[PDB]
């Protein structure tokens, strides 16, 4: 109902899936407005870095 953080999860769904080209560009637009959310994404590469 009122969770700006989870907003990244919704969009992230398209960033992880082979969605269309337009979608990929959309998600990026959202994450851009959410600097505290994008931090979650890094968690992956951070926990999966070589």
């Amino acid at each position: 109902g009122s969770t700006p953080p989870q907003a990244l999860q919704q969009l992230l769904q398209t960033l992880k899936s082979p969605s269309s080209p337009q979608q990929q560009q959309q998600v990026l637009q959202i994450l851009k407005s959410n600097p505290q959310l994008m931090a979650a994404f890094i968690k992956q590469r951070s926990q999966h870095q070589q």
């Binding site: 109902g1 899936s17 959410n34």
Partner: protein, 45 residues
Amino acid sequence: GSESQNDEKALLDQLDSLLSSTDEMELAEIDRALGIDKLVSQQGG
């Protein structure tokens, strides 16, 4: 809507592993868009 119970989000963590399989450049394009590169730098935590 409902409190707790992610489900969807949990589904991402699964595919997230692909990140290690795919080149950082694949996401670097959008990454720089959000600014995940200069997110840490000298933060630590």
